Amino acid sequence: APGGRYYPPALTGLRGSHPGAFEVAHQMGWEKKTFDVDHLPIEEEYDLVVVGGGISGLAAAWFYRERHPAARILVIENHDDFGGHAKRNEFQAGGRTILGYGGSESLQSPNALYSEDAKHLLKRLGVELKRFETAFDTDFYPGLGLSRAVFFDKASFGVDKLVSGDPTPMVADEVPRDRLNARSWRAFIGDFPLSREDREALIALYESPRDYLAGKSVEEKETYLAKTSYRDYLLKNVGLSETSVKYFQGRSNDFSALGADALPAADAYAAGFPGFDALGLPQPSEEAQAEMDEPYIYHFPDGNASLARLMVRDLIPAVAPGRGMEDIVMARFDYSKLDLAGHPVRLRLNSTAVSVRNRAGGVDVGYSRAGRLHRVRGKHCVMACYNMMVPYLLRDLSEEQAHALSQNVKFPLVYTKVLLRNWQAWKTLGIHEIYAPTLPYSRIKLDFPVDLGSYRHPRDPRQPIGVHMVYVPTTPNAGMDARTQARVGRSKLYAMSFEQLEKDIRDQLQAMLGPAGFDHRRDITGITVNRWSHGYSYFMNTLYDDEAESEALMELARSKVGNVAIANSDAAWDAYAHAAIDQAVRAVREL
Numbered sequence: 001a002p003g004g005r006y007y008p009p010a011l012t013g014l015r016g017s018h019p020g021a022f023e024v025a026h027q028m029g030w031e032k033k034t035f036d037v038d039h040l041p042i043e044e045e046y047d048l049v050v051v052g053g054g055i056s057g058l059a060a061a062w063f064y065r066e067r068h069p070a071a072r073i074l075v076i077e078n079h080d081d082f083g084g085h086a087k088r089n090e091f092q093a094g095g096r097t098i099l100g101y102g103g104s105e106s107l108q109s110p111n112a113l114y115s116e117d118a119k120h121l122l123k124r125l126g127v128e129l130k131r132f133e134t135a136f137d138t139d140f141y142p143g144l145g146l147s148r149a150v151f152f153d154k155a156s157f158g159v160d161k162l163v164s165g166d167p168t169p170m171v172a173d174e175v176p177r178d179r180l181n182a183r184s185w186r187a188f189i190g191d192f193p194l195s196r197e198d199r200e201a202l203i204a205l206y207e208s209p210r211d212y213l214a215g216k217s218v219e220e221k222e223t224y225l226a227k228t229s230y231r232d233y234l235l236k237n238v239g240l241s242e243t244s245v246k247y248f249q250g251r252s253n254d255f256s257a258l259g260a261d262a263l264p265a266a267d268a269y270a271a272g273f274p275g276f277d278a279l280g281l282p283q284p285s286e287e288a289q290a291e292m293d294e295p296y297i298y299h300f301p302d303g304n305a306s307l308a309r310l311m312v313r314d315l316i317p318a319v320a321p322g323r324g325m326e327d328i329v330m331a332r333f334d335y336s337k338l339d340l341a342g343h344p345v346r347l348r349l350n351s352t353a354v355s356v357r358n359r360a361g362g363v364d365v366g367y368s369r370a371g372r373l374h375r376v377r378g379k380h381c382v383m384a385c386y387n388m389m390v391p392y393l394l395r396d397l398s399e400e401q402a403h404a405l406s407q408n409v410k411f412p413l414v415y416t417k418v419l420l421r422n423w424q425a426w427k428t429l430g431i432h433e434i435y436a437p438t439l440p441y442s443r444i445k446l447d448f449p450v451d452l453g454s455y456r457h458p459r460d461p462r463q464p465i466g467v468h469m470v471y472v473p474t475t476p477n478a479g480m481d482a483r484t485q486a487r488v489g490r491s492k493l494y495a496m497s498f499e500q501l502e503k504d505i506r507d508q509l510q511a512m513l514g515p516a517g518f519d520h521r522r523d524i525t526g527i528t529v530n531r532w533s534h535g536y537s538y539f540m541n542t543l544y545d546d547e548a549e550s551e552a553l554m555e556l557a558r559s560k561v562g563n564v565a566i567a568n569s570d571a572a573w574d575a576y577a578h579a580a581i582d583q584a585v586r587a588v589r590e591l
């Protein structure tokens, strides 16, 4: 968008891993081109060079500077904005800003899951978690009488049908259970477009649970459920029909990046799926219960992009005024201040690192920016990029360590923001969120209502609002393992133009909201598609992976290489912001 201030959050259209962000990376990864910089002069010298400008890389710079207050630090990032998966999206509607989150969504169970170091970072940045108990408008949608709904599609169920009053409790649920505005299981499932037989079988799944593994010991049941997909468990042990289990296919797409065919039944049990109540399995532990019980309210209006923005402002005060969690939300960021010469911390966007080599007690780093190669030097280096990227960069890796890094196959996801002129159609249909079992977008919702800083969430159904929807390009029921579904999902996204992505959005919104007078051409006033082709870190999947071999690969992959330490959430095989922070802390301590 030339002619305006350099300001990525205001961009709409094809975002996430946008055109321009990945082309050099694919020249290495797909064509095996090597970009050597050993014959170029060193242009700049730092104490620390960080490859990758997501939460992990920014946390690496932050904890390094805490240990080394005078440190000169360069962060090299290939997207056009900092933050990695944590991106701020903006819309202009009716003279005001509407904020959305491009990716990394909320702080997950922070009281239970965030380490003392991560809590220390939040404290120093001015984030008081208790503020979200009032910032998050928990009773807003429930108090309007709205509920969650399931949209059955004609292609999979014979008819389009929206069924509201869903009582399903979700893993990370922002709605109190007594505020779901839901119906009984019998009344809810009674409206499903399924045969009477299938409807009775689903209702009995809730009303009359049975020990589908009768005879087995608890240990044998746990082993079986770790090795059996949720879908197969429902088919073979519960006995639901192939059409019945379709209702469950996409429910796990968002939180696991795969469908029920690739979800271990044991993981479905931990996530609160039905069918386990009479198996006699142990109740979840203290940690599992304290984590599951925390309200899912720790949501800045732009998601975890606020964490990245807080860190950038703390590292480079010239970029934006202010301090603390309230004024960050509408703070104005000046991107021309990110990379100023002589300044101790510099964040260099649109730059793909291509080479990392230990030399003479320091680290030489090559990168490509605007098609030209550059060479810089640090005493230390943190690889905070995608771990499968590291073997193409770090020239000092053993064959074994390079292979281990390559086994972290990340999952693709698409987080789409849609600006609507109004949300009367949602009010008329009595809904604030829709689950679609088989369609591309499995989750479609009015955005979380959060008031923070000077930002107020949209309130008036006659006025504009942001919608969030999740599309995961799974290939269900094909016999693929998880790594293959992930790679194939990326191939599917690579083949799709923005025009094809927009058609899927407009088609599905029109089919679901149209009966209430929605007109996609008239009522959609903005679309931002955050394409996270390399989204969640891989995670150990008991359907396909051996735990002992997987933990060994993970630990080998993140082994320090001279003065080069390895971070990113990938290094934990754990797709969370607190893992991104903790892996950076480990890497900084190693140096």
Ligand SMILES: Cc1cc2nc3c(=O)[nH]c(=O)nc-3n(C[C@H](O)[C@H](O)[C@H](O)COP(=O)(O)OP(=O)(O)OC[C@H]3O[C@@H](n4cnc5c(N)ncnc54)[C@H](O)[C@@H]3O)c2cc1C
Residues within 6 Å of the ligand: 025, 051, 052, 053, 054, 055, 056, 057, 076, 077, 078, 079, 083, 084, 085, 086, 102, 103, 104, 105, 106, 107, 108, 304, 351, 352, 353, 354, 384, 385, 386, 389, 393, 413, 414, 415, 532, 534, 535, 536, 537, 568, 569, 570, 575, 576, 577, 578, 580
């Ligand atoms: C759609 C989505 C939703 C999520 N929601 C949540 C949530 O609610 N809660 C939660 O805790 N976590 C969530 N996450 C997990 C998320 O991965 C982490 O929260 C965190 O954002 C990851 O930070 P990171 O630094 O580990 O990785 P990233 O954010 O991916 O940062 C790595 C960066 O390195 C860059 N890079 C790669 N190669 C190079 C190179 N050669 N040179 C330079 N830079 C390079 C990448 O382009 C990227 O920008 C979500 C993730 C996704 C994809």
Ligand code: HEM
Residues within 6 Å of the ligand: 017, 018, 021, 022, 025, 026, 028, 029, 030, 078, 079, 386, 388, 389, 392, 406, 409, 486, 487, 488, 490, 491, 493, 494, 495, 531, 533, 534
């Ligand atoms: C910051 C953005 C990106 C980076 C750094 C990046 C980097 C890479 C690398 C290094 C590989 C090789 C993996 C290996 O050999 O182990 C790869 C694979 C691949 N990428 Fe990307 N890529 C990016 C964005 C994208 C986008 C936007 C798409 C599609 C729209 C895409 C599609 C694919 C596909 C299909 C593969 C092959 C399957 C796989 O091995 O995962 N990538 N990417």
